[PDB]
């Protein structure tokens, strides 16, 4: 029933108890935001400014660094663009995923000229190979943004890259891309408000729908500016967008453009007395709690208030069964520009747009062999009407009166000799980490919030940008421009 | 540039300094919310549960009362109706207003059967009369709600009663009525969310426009549920409405109904960085500062956040020049329920809807003589498209860190050595009054126990402030510079 940490600690105390291994980062670098955890290779990769690191996730003081800056020529070109020589004209690594069984794929802002390449790690982890394959350099457009201020939700599977970010120099052509591989890169309609409206990506996950890979979907989480009318009402909408991994675009229309793209509002609010709810629209981070059933990973989300005078944070939970229901629900439909959004009620193209091409029903092989009505629809119906509410219609945690806001989250399923509890590790914009448990107080609905620890993990206060949980090292890794930080999950002999 | 009070005295500290005179109220009464300040008679009237008091503006310890509790039969028909005998089946007065030069008009919850009567107080404030003219008894349909939990905004001028409440037993028929005074009662359209949609009234004021009494309009202030498509997103819209004092409805169609009603949204928000503003739509009280020009009183308003989690209160100022600009602008317009609201680009009938009939300009000297096209319009065009923003597009004061919320307000115009300064005495839902000057002087508790301040009057001819609540009334001096 309290909101005070039963165990508070500062970077100081943490350092005087063996609970923090700080990497202060090189003097000629920053922005250690991109994390690529690798349990197998037992290393923790962190792509930053002009560099890419390979930390030893047992003690991040031991590592390797691939200095990957940009050519003098490129630097100058960025300079001539009237940009910030130090803050902007640098190669900020924004993408870092796995590719070959011996190479990583990395992308970054090549000083407002996105470039990517490979990072040979090798076959055997025994011989820690951290070699950068220079001279190649592939087009970074659509993979890493031009502006370092923008992030990227990346997902690299089966040799193909999925990434949502701003694709242009002007940084106003945001789109979900599918690069690499065999086929021509896939993209979302550009300059189309109904598809994407000045969004900001958070993450992308490969979620299987059944035992048939043919039915694999890729979910992107992101926030964007709402759209409804020409009335005084700007607003944010956290969202989740689904797309079929086996989508290859239209035939005589959406050429090389997703055909199975749909989105739904993710609502994270707290019911009120007079019937008006309090919403946490600003989606900051998302973590998937892998259930034994890969088809139903639990979705935790870290949301924030839109108001500048009412700072607040929330942690909402969603079940895929819900998102799937929404995605199988009414399509948001609007007749004219000055019409109220209404749930579409009348003839839906078959197969249902949004549904992946199946060699069992309809028989239609490949998206490229779909009717025209199933391409015209979806093309103007990217959004679902009904929103997906959190489990139980409320967040499992809320922090208001506090002076900081949540920025990252990860959770471990710890089995206790009296049941299992989902322990959340929430990162703050202040540089502190909170460990909380939401045990159901006597009954689901009236649950108790327990703040176990509040540990600062950076000499100076900074915004936490990345968190990676290791269930093989039992170590948490925080990231920021100030550098990376490592700490143990527990500390049971200090309570 | 601060948030801490220079003078934070508690009730104990206020009582131990003659800073507050307390009336713990009667045991058989409560809800002392209906205030009526009479300078001339130097008394302060008050409406309450089965009672109507009369406090002395010098010492509320000295007072007269009137017992008006509803008969047995009525108390019984209310019980069988399935109401709470203790907190419902009683006569809670909701309207106290001066009527004749010798009488006051009063109405209360007739134990869910509102009734009204007069209250004699003679010509001379010397004889201090307070006789409850019993017998007869008129009904209070449209004058007072049936439900004590509902407020009412009244204004009785020229022998006419203007009020906005629930005209029904079920408390669902909210309306703005004008009863009394020579003509058949006139009211807003029943069951039409466009006109009014589950509103909560706050107050009505007469404000002339021109130097012609015929252009006089009555303005109501209230808060109601916004309407914007079947699509969800419940929200509150603070509002202000106007009505011509001389509106008596049409010949046929809109018969005995406002043909001049128009209403506009009142915005009180704070600009944000990402273009998103923080709004305070829950109007709580209104005070008009009589400026030099009687056609331009400054409008102060106390708004609160709709959010149950984040508590926050704000005060906002509005000029009647702005309000009038909005009423002379585009009406809101819809082609149906599935359409977006849009400023009416069509051709507005003449005379312009919302325009008081006049024996001068206009050509018409009666609202009943208006043509069909205007009456038809209006009937479906009671709302305006442009909301009226507050002076500077910002609120004067803000409180969010605070763990309470404003509930009442009054302001005094005090002449000093530097110039005139407007001091705002803000009430609180936790028994407390904040004194504020602009460009927090003191935070004083005024009740032994915490409650909601629901009434607040200011007597300049006595330099005192009176606060209302269910606990009782509280007297307090505007300054007491000694404590400083
Ligand atoms: C050009 C560049 O930034 N890379 C240097 C790298 O060559 C050097 O070994 C290291 C030592 O701290 O410092 C980095 O900043
Ligand atoms: C070992 C292997 O088969 N993986 C390949 C690697 O051989 C190749 O050089 C690289 C592109 O440079 O792409 C990887 O996926
Ligand atoms: C409810 C009622 O009938 N009113 C009584 C009144 O007769 C009496 O004069 C007064 C003073 O004690 O107390 C009230 O409760």
Curated annotation (Swiss-Prot), chain A:
One BP annotation, GO: axonal fasciculation
GO CC, one annotated term: cerebellar climbing fiber to Purkinje cell synapse
Main location: secreted
Transmembrane segments: none
Bridged cysteine pairs (disulfide): 78-89, 107-116, 244-356, 268-316
Localization per Swiss-Prot or TrEMBL: Secreted
Keyword tRNA-binding: no
UniProt entry keywords in alphabetical sequence: Developmental protein, Differentiation, Disulfide bond, Glycoprotein, Immunoglobulin domain, Neurogenesis, Secreted, Signal
Sema domain location: 6-489
Domain of life: Eukaryota
A GO molecular-function annotation: neuropilin binding
Known glycosylation sites: 28, 100
Family that this chain belongs to: Belongs to the semaphorin family.
Function noted in UniProt: Plays a role in growth cones guidance. May function to pattern sensory projections by selectively repelling axons that normally terminate dorsally. Involved in the development of the olfactory system and in neuronal control of puberty.
Record's subunit section: Interacts with PXND1.
Domain free text: Strong binding to neuropilin is mediated by the carboxy third of the protein.
Protein name: Semaphorin-3A
